[PDB]
Write a protein that binds this ligand. Structure first.
Ligand SMILES: CSC[C@H]1O[C@@H](n2cnc3c(N)ncnc32)[C@H](O)[C@@H]1O
Ligand SMILES: CSC[C@H]1O[C@@H](n2cnc3c(N)ncnc32)[C@H](O)[C@@H]1O
Ligand SMILES: CSC[C@H]1O[C@@H](n2cnc3c(N)ncnc32)[C@H](O)[C@@H]1O
Ligand SMILES: CSC[C@H]1O[C@@H](n2cnc3c(N)ncnc32)[C@H](O)[C@@H]1O
Ligand SMILES: CSC[C@H]1O[C@@H](n2cnc3c(N)ncnc32)[C@H](O)[C@@H]1O
Ligand SMILES: CSC[C@H]1O[C@@H](n2cnc3c(N)ncnc32)[C@H](O)[C@@H]1O
Lengths: 270, 270, 270, 270, 270, 270
């Protein structure tokens, strides 16, 4: 209902401990209209290299919004209104495997959705769409993230299955045994779904850079929120370097053959 | 979330007894995406004179949707996505005044909102808008409707205050005495609000052609749904003639000086 | 979804201070299925004279449900499932006029609906119904109530306009001046609407026996909940006598010519 | 709240690609009252052989309703009000196993519910019911469907576990590996639950005829909505033949000994 | 669910154009738990004179929240958790009378509620409360506001009826004529209700300092949001002086004899 | 919003077949305020030994509330308002293993949450909390329950994984095979989650005493509601003895060292 005059081709969605992405030189905060109401915060917009970039902290100012209350539709709609083509999510995750250690990055390639009662789609009728997500992340962006990590010499696992739980409580031991044994999951978080679904429906090229902030239930002392925040804080500098480099590496527009969600809505529409 | 290829500059919203507007030569039915879900029906689009026109029956096929359940936001959003600039509503009303006759048309110039449980706006935050509705209908379209009625020699009252009630029950006698003797309202219906509000927010020029289908509680036998249906049926041919002529008469774009809602969002935005 | 084996032709809905109607000799409590979930309480069913009667306290056990949270649809649906044809409401009201004194009964003949955001109908589509309620109470039942009061020599006003407000707060002085001066209201309460609407839609013969429990804002000390409960308690015996007598007076089925809502759905259905 | 004059003993619920069942000789479309609002479309009612049959396309006209927005309660309630005793569902599914072929029918005998945000029951209180679903489909109807397929020489698998997912997105590879390798499910879709639950609660004998329209993520090219549509279209004639024959074959009333849900509410009611 | 260590005896709720109250010397922003979710913003807490004061902008940062979406329950709950006893609202209003001029303050003593569909109470059951609102504002605080304005020689009307509308649209001419000529309202706004009700239920001493920012529909050019903003900006300094002075004048606790909501819940409980 | 004068240190939440706990000598029923509306019933409070104990039947009077509609937040809030530190749940469960026999008690130590669409937390923002649930039950209370069962010579399994399903339908055979063989669950029920989460967030010491009432799908005749009721009736006396003994054994306050939720909110807060 509003003409959005601001434009950005790249969107960053920041997770726990990343309210300030530390990537902008000059920037401003803007309110963006959505038919779903409030995005998590005003969007920060500014130039990085030759790129106009939009940033949004998914938990909002002061980490005031828990995963189950995030307005995922408003956040993705807002980025779409700005013309965003690439979406880089930075997230905090638990590790369910010994070799994915604290402070390691992970560029997941799969997910398993264990959320409950979230709003999963932009398409509620009369235009019905069923997006394919066999390979749910954008291949081209994943590959560029991996290349960036390699170039920077930042320890990064190049695949992984993210299990997304509802929260806000952390998992029981019986649940975590299931995640690791039943679903073959590698990392765990609360915010990936429906963010990734909605980005795909919006024909964006979305990928997650996850950082391991805890060992879930598997260390001598189980995960706590305090641990997650502490570990993310210890590693923000690395995250910012990776982010700054990746943003400048991105081509103008995602390749069709390397982005399954780009322009693929046609075969998803009934 | 999808590109709307179809375009129409004029939208008709049909009320009771007007499922088939009887104005189209060639037409087709389309599904239009909205972030509010289902419009009342598929939109009918087709060419009349040099105009592309979209039609929507607000109660849907078979009059299946009562006023309190109409998805007003989806209906107006759908018309907006088609590029509609002019919205002509045709509506059945009761007369609260006994100097009017059944079958008279009324082009109201004011309203009083007594609705109770509706969604009134497209603007729920963070972009806050407060649209001026002192003169709630589009003056240029009202004037053109009045000229058309005069040209056709169709009996039409050129002003009036529409009181919009919640329904679906009709008013009590005590309520109607209030509407007429105290509020000084002229006509009564259930569907004007929030349709008119939303059209204004969408920067569309909106006007109502109301036809008097009953005398509310004031005749010997009080209004019934059966009477409304019957009287509307007796006068549909007249309504179609008025509609057909008006559509032909409209200029391509409403003037900013004769449309208070056209391009006026600027001063409504906080 | 459940076959209701219990049957009653008369339903009593008790208001403030009438959790125990004091009319039954032998009775039992039953759970009644509704597609709207929970009625206010289990229904009490038992014989009075030759009549099977169902009783429901609208505020539930311990007056635990305020007017804005009453499941009006469930309550009326439950009575319909039992085969109820006559519904007698007993209510506590404020008086807006000096001559309607504490402890006086009133058999209102009109109402004005000032409620907000309640669920007003059983008909949400695809079967659309607009019930006439020009004279919103059942004439035959009102007349029988009036006759009963006359026979018992119980002081009772034989007409009156009930203004129904949302609550739970009581009215401001400016509001009450409006009710008495703008809407020409005589008594005031919070529970009549949508109970009366829904009873009409269910083709029941509904009437209210109101008792004046306070003078709203117009006495030296404005109405309080404590006053309402105290005054109702002082007059329960009278209310019970009136109720017991009226119940036995009722014909088997309401007369068609004396019940506007009985079998009148036909002309209300679009 | 209104008396349903129309009656049918058999109900068909059509899925993707089956808006027109192509089984009726003479038929009409009716609006059916429900306390849950709108069924997916008007019901089509007509006579086939000696049977009165009701048909409902679960996605509505133009496939306008996605699985997560279908009003399952209204659809089943509507069929119940028509007196339906047998419900035949025809549904498009993916195969999770590579020994099946596209176009095969499957008559599943089990399901696993992975849906997320639906309304699962007609019983929200105060009448609490917990229906047994150990064998969730009606055995007598499954057996008759299997016999019909054998008689017609239509390739049909006579058992299988249907995993129902939330959608509208299709599964990730990690999810599908779980569904097949761990859960041991055979077919996958989005619409079975809560349709089957609700039919059981309504004491109707329900069975699914599923047709394999894709191999989910397991073929060289993963499932798309386009493929589902295309493959269903290739096999509609076969589906119609099966449906027409089965309908003719049904006895007037399912047996209590071969229908676990028929007249079994007794032991489910607390 | 958490212990609130921060304390304040006075709460300020700021309206349009008052995001920064300009009254604090040193202060900090805090997040306050409520069972209703998010207050409009973080609460600013700091010392003024010998008083600990809490401030909340009801529209939030950047005026992002419109009146119909304000979480009134969370705002008032948050203040209650801090121990607030006095609540001073500062609000922009339209004047319905040409002698209440732009920039004049008004200390209303009455209100009329024309809102629709908001959440009006903290008491939804099983503890039912009906607060008396005959004189809806705290007399002691009104009197102190009036004294302060007199002492500062700031032009202030010492009574008035505030009519609260739903918005976000402004009133039609017919509505405005009704508010003035029929309801006898003096000023108009969108935010007073349910804020004032909830403060009363919370046993706070609440009063409004209103500033006239427009003449609604009654000037040559009807009210716009731009005008409201502009006029409030022209008078903020004056409002801040009034506010700063009043805050220091307040006694430690409101006297029960001059605060009808203070410790009066007892007689409101059924 | 009201001061709760009543106090209890121990809360009992009774499940199926335990409306009357049979532990009180003298007691009364009280209404307890919550910002979430109605607890399942009035709370019974009374003294046992030197302990003030509060009792709540989670299904309410007459087992009127099914698991999916229980107001878990109101129930736990109400207990918190009373000062409850220990919460003993008594629940009917199915056994997924043929060595956990009918009438056996189980003191589970783990759970798996398969519920859908319930409200899982008291913390919706702006105070975000992620409670640790690795060992979801209070160890100190579990140990005391186990000791009590040993002392009374009541057959009790001293560990086990409870899988919580949504209901109200019972599981299919395919689901049940999955719960046992895949998730490694031992017992199954519908009410544990979110009750246990919310108790942890409220810093209570919560444990479940489960009684095996059926073998789910694994006996010759699958579970029915009638069977659950019957078997629980056969063992109530035993459950009451266990309960009465345990209540008296409890120390005044749970030791922080043996209660992970006690005073642990600090590290859960972001
Ligand atoms: C600040 S702590 C809460 C955040 O931690 C992330 N997270 C980190 N570790 C885990 C874990 N082991 N399980 C679930 N979510 C986690 C979640 O996505 C959530 O937003
Ligand atoms: C077909 S009957 C119901 C319709 O009648 C219109 N209507 C006609 N007369 C009246 C009246 N007197 N009061 C309210 N609505 C009316 C309403 O807008 C509604 O959609
Ligand atoms: C027990 S106090 C609350 C009840 O009093 C009734 N009532 C009595 N007097 C009044 C009044 N003056 N205004 C509004 N409701 C009233 C209402 O319907 C409400 O359920
Ligand atoms: C027309 S494409 C969408 C439909 O396909 C059905 N369907 C077909 N194949 C699959 C699959 N592999 N996974 C989930 N749903 C499917 C679903 O029930 C949905 O209504
Ligand atoms: C910034 S413009 C919108 C604000 O103006 C206030 N307001 C000012 N003038 C008026 C008016 N004439 N009618 C209604 N609200 C008004 C309302 O409370 C709203 O929050
Ligand atoms: C009175 S029957 C319904 C109750 O049985 C409990 N229950 C008992 N056995 C089972 C089972 N096998 N599966 C699920 N819930 C069960 C549930 O928690 C529910 O409240």
């Amino acid at each position: 209902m509003i003409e959005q005059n601001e434009k950005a081709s790249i969107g960053i969605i920041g997770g726990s401990g990343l309210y300030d992405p530390g990537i902008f030189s000059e920037s401003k905060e803007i309110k963006v209209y959505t038919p779903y109401g409030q995005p998590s915060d005003f969007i920060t917009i500014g130039k990085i290299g030759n790129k106009s970039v939009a940033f949004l902290p998914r938990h909002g100012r002061g980490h005031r919004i828990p995963p189950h209350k995030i307005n995922y539709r408003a956040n993705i709609w807002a980025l779409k209104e700005l013309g965003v083509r690439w979406v880089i999510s930075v997230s905090a995750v638990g590790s369910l495997r010994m070799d994915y250690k604290l402070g390691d990055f992970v560029i997941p390639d799969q997910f398993i959705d264990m959320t409950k009662n979230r709003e999963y789609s932009f398409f509620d009728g009369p235009v019905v769409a069923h997006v394919s997500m066999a390979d749910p992340f954008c291949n081209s962006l994943r590959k560029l993230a991996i290349e960036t990590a390699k170039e920077l010499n930042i320890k990064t696992h190049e695949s992984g299955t993210y299990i997304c739980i509802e929260g806000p409580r952390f998992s029981t031991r019986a649940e975590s045994r299931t995640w690791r044994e039943v679903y073959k999951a590698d990392i765990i978080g609360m915010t990936l779904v429906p963010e990734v679904n909605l980005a795909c429906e919006a024909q964006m090229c979305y990928a997650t850079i996850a950082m391991v902030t805890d060992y879930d239930v598997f260390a001598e002392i189980p995960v706590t929120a305090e641990e997650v925040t502490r570990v993310m804080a210890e590693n923000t500098e690395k995250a910012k370097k990776l982010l700054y480099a990746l943003i400048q590496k991105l081509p103008e527009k995602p390749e069709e053959g390397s982005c399954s969600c780009c322009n693929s809505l046609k075969t998803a529409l009934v």
